[PDB]
């Protein structure tokens, strides 16, 4: 089955964090759903998870600070972290929780325990922690010989993270290659995305780089011409 | 670390080879030998018999 | 089940049970019920030659 | 939480789980690659989903005294990533931790030169008041590169943000290097340059204003 995630991106610290996931591919008062994390610099970090009688079961490393809901009505699956600080910076992934029963001996003696394996995950969401709010870069046009050119945009001063950059729609493809960003002393991110042209398609095609920074939420078209 | 048995830990102190000299070791022991010794009931037990 | 041997006095030595290895499983007996209610059967047929 | 484990080119590696299960077993096994989704190889001690292909294997639970190992056999470069290992015992009781990360990195891979490509600050950032010179390095191995900015004849020390390495869908690492100015700095010298060093060897490129 698909799932996919969406965030605000960025809050303030010592409020309310909610975050949603919307599951594709099968019902979702049929499974079980939890909930995974993974700050910078730490391990996957269980949240929690509830049951098809949503009845829900969270990691007590949390201090009781998620919880998780179902919506038949709109089959999204929503985990709110509830008063968080800078360390609670992470990516969340909502996934399918199938459970296994170990026997190793009589039922009636409860000599089995039941165990919980994830096999259906989802991209995951970037979420940030800062005091600071949301900036849009303002991104330029890199103008463009072994028969290609290079071609980029420049996506300059953004915060937070991530951007993701399209070329064409559908048209450009490769050799698209976006650059991981870059964490400024002021605090700021910015990225590059350059693509491989060949030197006659110049003059001739039109090229535009679709600059998505969805928590900011920024959008700047620009039409690259040497 | 189960929740919601029949054997219990019970740690006390035992005399050793010399007389002045007490150690403090472990033991497992069953449910069936051992009652407690204050029914007040805090966790502390003495054997059966 | 472990064997935890502690010297309680010079040349006594006391034997205590020492952590389990593997899981806890409580003792139990198994009877083929096929076989019992079988035999249940031919000890009433007995049992009714004094009572009736 | 990372274990660092080094191997080669599809030798043969035991990852070996960092708990001992003190019971009857059940052990799932994650691989976790950096700004992926986690993906399920092992559940169940040794059963693996569809997709799975042959080359990641479990260890059986048969009471025997065996420690949980995972078992892959042959590692590409797209094998190297995080392994977590899931313990469930019926001893420790509802495991919440999925433990320490084995990350795994894939050695002797053939040396890849770096492909850079410098970019002048755009016009339109000229007339914000601003100057950024990018200089974008990529399709290089090992990930070890130094890179140098030089006004004129005398190398620039201050301004220089430059990304760390990282391997991307190529397996291959890529790099960026921004050296920010302002308008009459750009234009004061003829000409810059950005200059890394792969492996002890020297490659550079060149703008200037016009
Ligand atoms: C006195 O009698 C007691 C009662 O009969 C008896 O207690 C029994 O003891 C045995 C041995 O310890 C236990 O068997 C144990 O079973 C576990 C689990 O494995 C079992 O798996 C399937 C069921 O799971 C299936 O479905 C799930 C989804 O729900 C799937 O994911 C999974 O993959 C399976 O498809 C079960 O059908 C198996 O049985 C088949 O397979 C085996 C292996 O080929 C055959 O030998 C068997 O005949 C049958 O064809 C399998 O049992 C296992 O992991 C352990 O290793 C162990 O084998 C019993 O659970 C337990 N209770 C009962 C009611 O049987 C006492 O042992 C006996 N003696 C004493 C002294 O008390
Ligand atoms: C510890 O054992 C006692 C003995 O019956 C039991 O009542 C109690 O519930 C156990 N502790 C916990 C936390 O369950
Ligand atoms: C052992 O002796 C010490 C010191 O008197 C005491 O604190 C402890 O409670 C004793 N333990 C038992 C099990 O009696
Ligand atoms: C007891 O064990 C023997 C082993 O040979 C087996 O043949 C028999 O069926 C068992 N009976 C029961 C009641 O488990
Ligand atoms: C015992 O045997 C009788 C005779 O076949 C049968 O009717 C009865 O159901 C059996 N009971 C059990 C417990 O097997």
Redesign the pocket.
Known sequence: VQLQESGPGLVRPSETLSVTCIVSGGSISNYYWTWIRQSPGKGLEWIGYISDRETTTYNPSLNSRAVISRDTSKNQLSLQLRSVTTADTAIYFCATARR?????????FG??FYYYYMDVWGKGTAVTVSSASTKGPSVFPLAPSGGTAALGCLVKDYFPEPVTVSWNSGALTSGVHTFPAVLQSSGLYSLSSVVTVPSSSLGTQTYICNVNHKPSNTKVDKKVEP | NITDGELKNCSFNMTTELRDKRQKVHALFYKLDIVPINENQNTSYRLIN | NTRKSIRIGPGQWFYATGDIIGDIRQA???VSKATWNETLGKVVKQLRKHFG | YVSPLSVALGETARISCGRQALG?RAVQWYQHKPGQAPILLIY?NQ?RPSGIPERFSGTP?I?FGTTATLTISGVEVGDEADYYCHMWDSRSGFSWSFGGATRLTVLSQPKAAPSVTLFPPSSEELQANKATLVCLISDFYPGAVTVAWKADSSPVKAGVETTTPSKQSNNKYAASSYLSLTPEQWKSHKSYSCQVTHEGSTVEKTVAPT
């Open positions: 296994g029963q170990r026997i190793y001996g009589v039922v009636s000599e089995f | 139990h007996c198994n | 009857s169940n059963d639970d009471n």
